[PDB]
Design a binder for this molecule. Structure first.
Ligand SMILES: *[C@@H]1O[C@H](CO)[C@@H](O)[C@H](O)[C@H]1NC(C)=O
Lengths: 23, 40
């Protein structure tokens, strides 16, 4: 989790159904 | 004046309807995606 590092005009992102705790 | 202001867009989202089948009941509940209920 620590290794991996990375809404205005009508674009949205939906959260996943399963949270990281469930995985 | 010499003030500092921030511009963030007005809230928007896609309303969706959650429903059991009409063969069971009729009441439904809506869901406002990406919305803080202080506005609704
Ligand atoms: C919704 O707005 C209120 C305004 O006081 C704020 O306190 C609250 O944290 C907001 N909720 C979210 C999820 O941002």
């Amino acid at each position: 989790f620590n290794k991996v590092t990375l809404k205005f005009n009508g674009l949205t992102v939906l959260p996943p159904l399963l949270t990281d705790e469930m995985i | 004046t010499l003030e500092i202001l921030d511009i963030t867009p007005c809230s928007f989202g896609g309303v969706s309807v959650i429903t059991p089948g009409t063969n069971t009941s009729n009441q439904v509940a809506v869901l406002y995606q990406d919305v803080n209920c202080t506005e609704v």
